[PDB]
Design a protein around this ligand. Sequence first.
Ligand code: FES
Length: 98
Amino acid sequence: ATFKVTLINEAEGTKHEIEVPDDEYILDAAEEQGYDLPFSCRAGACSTCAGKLVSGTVDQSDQSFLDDDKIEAGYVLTCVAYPTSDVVIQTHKEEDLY
Ligand code: FES
């Protein structure tokens, strides 16, 4: 399967739509498709690539930085997140954790 992923940058008021395979991390797909997103560790151990889900679901089982509450609040580490449905997500949300 291939899911549609809508990336929203509220601060800049931009929107990008990309198609991501069910076995590819969002970050990777976005880059390949021409959209650079913030990142640092690239390994699910930091908050640089944080995004916030608006709708849809993902699988970010490889992540380790986010606690359960953050997860419940909809936060996602885009560098290790696989879409499990069509998703709409807000990017550049790191600030939200401080
Ligand atoms: S870039 Fe560090 S968790 Fe994604």
